[PDB]
Design a protein around this ligand. Structure first.
Ligand SMILES: CC(C)Oc1cc(N2CCNCC2)ccc1-c1c(C(N)=O)[nH]c2cc(F)c(Cl)cc12
Ligand SMILES: [Mn+2]
Ligand SMILES: [Mn+2]
Length: 365
């Protein structure tokens, strides 16, 4: 079976034997005295440990292949004039089809981020949002797919005006640097230090004004767990080590502002607190909403549009109650200072026993 234009054929139909394309495979970086970790590629113990988890790597690969094909389609049509709603809906429709959405077993890991300009992350339009993408907008397209809770967290930046070209190059270079420096036993702060050094080596000129690119210091890479976008380990931009079999989202954000984000605009993103156990609720609308969240999202993220599409209404008080109780957490848009510009690049990497796999790498980024 071959992929259509626009893509509509599910990834598992293009690979009937259920063996999915590998991402970019890298030898681990050498240590401090220059002693390589190349031995991992040829170690018989490492190869058996790697094959024991083949089903897992395979679920990430299917999810990454859906991500590559969805984002390639998005890049062909994304244009100024389109509303943010139209963009998110058109992307998500393709995403659901290619991942072959099936409850909590296959689907969308989190809402389509499409944060604009000074806003770096966690903006997706709510119903009634009339925001239209502009020619001068710098749009961060951040969307996730998953197979059995093996999440692909991968993002890029869309622009139409070439004035942002050197800002995108800085961030792409800083993300690629973090990915190169990542490895088994590598300290998280060393990855962060390498990211910062490359990011700050760039100076950009946008509309007659110059800036030394700043990494957003409170927006960081992170470990990924099953049905858990952020598994608790962070890649900080400045003791904890990356470990074998761990999965990371290596993301960087460059800014012309303060290089610090703050909560701004109305909330659209939400996610159940991963650690919260069963909570008995009698309040009818609050009980019903939590049952909708548990059935459709579990510990995966969602947005208000995803509640609207399920036929839910008059849920705002019910959602505020879940947030007040600490069952669900709101994740509002994260914005740098007014008038600033932010860019982002992100990949998902598998720290396999034999090698580092940039599973979401494409021919695009
Ligand atoms: C930038 C911060 C605010 O992001 C997070 C922090 C936590 N924290 C849990 C509590 N402990 C601190 C970390 C958990 C998840 C995310 C997150 C990410 C991600 N980091 O890439 N992407 C997301 C997509 C979404 F739709 C939603 Cl709702 C949440 C996320
Ligand atoms: Mn992301
Ligand atoms: Mn992330």
């Amino acid at each position: 079976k071959v992929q259509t234009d626009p893509p509509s054929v599910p990834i598992c139909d293009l690979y009937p034997n259920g063996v999915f394309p590998k991402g970019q495979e890298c030898e681990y970086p050498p240590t401090q005295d220059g002693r390589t970790a190349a031995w991992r590629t040829t170690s018989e113990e490492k190869k058996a440990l790697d094959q024991a988890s083949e089903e897992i790597w395979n679920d990430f690969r299917e999810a990454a292949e859906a991500h590559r094909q969805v984002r390639k389609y998005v890049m062909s049509w994304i244009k100024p004039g389109m509303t943010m709603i139209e963009i998110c809906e058109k992307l998500e429709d393709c995403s659901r089809k290619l991942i072959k959405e099936n409850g909590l077993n296959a689907g969308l890991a989190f809402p389509t981020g499409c944060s604009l300009n000074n806003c770096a992350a966690h903006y997706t339009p709510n119903a009634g949002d009339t925001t239209v993408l502009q020619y001068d907008d710098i749009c961060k397209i951040d969307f996730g797919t998953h197979i059995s809770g093996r999440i692909i967290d991968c993002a890029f930046t869309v622009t139409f005006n070439p004035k942002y070209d050197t800002l995108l190059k800085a961030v792409k270079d800083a993300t690629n640097t973090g990915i190169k420096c990542a490895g088994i036993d590598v300290r998280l702060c060393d990855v962060g230090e390498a990211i910062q050094e490359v990011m700050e080596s760039y100076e950009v000129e946008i509309d007659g004004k110059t800036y030394q690119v700043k990494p957003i210091r409170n927006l960081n890479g992170h470990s990924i767990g099953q049905y858990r976008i952020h598994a608790g380990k962070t890649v900080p931009i400045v003791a904890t080590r990356m470990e074998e079999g761990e999965v990371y989202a290596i993301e960087t954000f460059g800014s012309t502002g303060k290089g610090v984000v703050h909560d701004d605009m109305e909330c659209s993103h939400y996610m159940k607190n991963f650690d919260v156990g069963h909570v008995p609720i009698r309040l009818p609308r609050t009980k019903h909403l939590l049952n909708v969240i548990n059935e459709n999202f579990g510990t995966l993220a969602f947005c208000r549009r995803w509640l609207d599409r399920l036929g839910e209404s008059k849920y705002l008080m019910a959602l505020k109650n879940l947030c007040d109780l600490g069952i669900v957490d709101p994740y509002p848009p994260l914005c740098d200072i007014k008038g600033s510009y932010t860019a982002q690049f992100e990949h998902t990497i598998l720290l396999r026993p034999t090698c580092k796999e940039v599973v979401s790498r494409g021919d695009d980024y």
